[PDB]
Amino acid sequence: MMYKEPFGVKVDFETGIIEGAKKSVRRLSDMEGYFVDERAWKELVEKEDPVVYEVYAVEQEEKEGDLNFATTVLYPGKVGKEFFFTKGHFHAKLDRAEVYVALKGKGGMLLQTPEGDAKWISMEPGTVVYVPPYWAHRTVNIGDEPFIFLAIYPADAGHDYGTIAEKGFSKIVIEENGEVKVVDNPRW
């Protein structure tokens, strides 16, 4: 049969960049209906519309058994009191797991089941996070530099953004009184 070519790519642990990879950029304007404070959101899009995160993805065709990988560069910032985060998604094939390796910066992961039960996992450089089957997953930057990580996921996992885009996560991550707090989402 035909076999695909093995390859190596260099990942820059300082920047998160993978040369030759498919780069995506999410600005604040790409994230309407995501943050609790919509007026803060609106003002920030009008003033500056900052980059929230960059993704450098190395993807295969969607086949059982195969693997994708991507780095994400999550910029530091808040919308109101709420730290910058990734959109978050379930997988289209719902039982697909995921593995994240934290490389630089300070943050964590919010995860939740289709029932809506949430989990928070702190991430520092060297933290490996196991995302099990069925858990939606979103990363949050709670520090003052880019939070940079590498994610490895099944090529056929796909992305299911819709549920999260409408209702969000049952927990939010905010700064209150000079302190990082994981608290119930008011809008849940």
Added chain:
Amino acid sequence: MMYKEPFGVKVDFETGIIEGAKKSVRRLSDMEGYFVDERAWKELVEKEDPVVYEVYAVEQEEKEGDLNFATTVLYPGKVGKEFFFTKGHFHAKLDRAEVYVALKGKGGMLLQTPEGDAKWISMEPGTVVYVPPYWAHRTVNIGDEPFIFLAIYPADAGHDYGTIAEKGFSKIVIEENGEVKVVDNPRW
């Protein structure tokens, strides 16, 4: 509904130790029939029997879509001219891919199709290697310090050592005249 609990674990990029993982140790004596220089193997076993590699594995049940991960510490050394390496394997489910992230030291990966078509990929810290479906894979330490890396693989991939145990790879990685060479395996 049964949902597995997400977790995070600290991986020390300087040691490759994962606390709480299933630890495997492979000494040179566990690697009979793997090295070209059989007399040099037997002598090093009698004189020292060093640890060739240690694995720290975090494994799930063998389920489609789920993921395992493991770090490996491949110690520096040669049997004759041939650098220390992992046993190497195809996956039991052949079409399963793997992703490796190099963390410390200097090394590389030898890859091979069921037809014996071979490939060599250099690995240095920050190198990410894509191991495609159907390729057997073996890591090699070409330096004087430990070669440390993380691997993420499908939970139902399995391991097939047999073919590699008896026949080996079609290429070998040796030190000849002060330089690293990937050359034809003379025993192939």
